Symmetry: C3
Subunit: 117 residues, 3 copies
């Protein structure tokens, strides 16, 4: 899985330990091994939410499976909680786009995750 956060919160406000916390908490939430979790944090961005430049975040989570109604609401609670606690971003100024990726459409290690045919 891969999780990206783009935010106008300054780099200096991203706490030590943040990428590792995301890595471990997403491993737990998705049931996938930590070794396969990638995280990407992009501070200092020029962005607005609702026309306001108060702290906000635009995020993406890509996973092969483990994407769906109840699961995505769970991820949102988890990830909004982290963004609120660590970056002081209000949950109602966060968007997270969820993508259920087909194994054939994710490349890795010179191939993809579709090895069957």
């Amino acid at each position: 899985p891969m999780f990206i956060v783009n935010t106008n919160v300054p780099r200096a406000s991203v706490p030590d330990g943040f990428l590792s916390e995301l890595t471990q908490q997403l491993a737990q939430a998705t049931g996938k091994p930590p070794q396969y979790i990638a995280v990407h944090v992009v501070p200092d961005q020029l962005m607005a939410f609702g026309g306001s430049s108060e702290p906000c975040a635009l995020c993406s989570l890509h996973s092969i499976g483990k994407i769906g109604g109840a699961q995505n609401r769970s991820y949102s609670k988890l990830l909004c909680g982290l963004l609120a606690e660590r970056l002081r971003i209000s949950p109602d100024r966060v968007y997270i786009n969820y993508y259920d990726m087909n194994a054939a459409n994710v490349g890795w290690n010179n191939s993809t995750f579709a090895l069957e045919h």
Copy 2:
């Protein structure tokens, strides 16, 4: 809705009020309220279009509904118009990827927009 612009145009060439203008124009175009519109502009990018590093932009528009053949042609005219006028980027050096998002696949405010089941 979420609109992202990545461009090699320098930061100083992005006019003040560009984010607000995008916000207003997108609210009008999509019929969604401004409070739900998120905009994100990323200047000074290392990019090429057709092998040239002249001004260009790679963009995305994510919306729950209001995405389709006719509407997208209309968005492209609107957004290329703004990028050309404000950032001086030629319309034939812009790509915009449109995404019709399922409500269940967009997280916000500790949950998603799938609140029904």
Copy 3:
């Protein structure tokens, strides 16, 4: 088509010619003229792969068609090869998301490709 690379490799480590090599190799690989290909390289990123911040990359390739099982495995070999050779990133620390775009959902030059 368009290709985006996000990496924690520093900008100074991105070699002269890299964007051009991606453009022409992707032209060859997708069969499209180089004039169609957009590439975007984002160095110096704050990222981790498997909990480690050794060199890694998160990438996307969007194309109207030319996306599929065998084709994507070919793109991955090509692109991982380039990232390993040029940016010294291990292939097992690269993800590439492939998107088969509908022509109606790609805007260009005041319109779409539909």
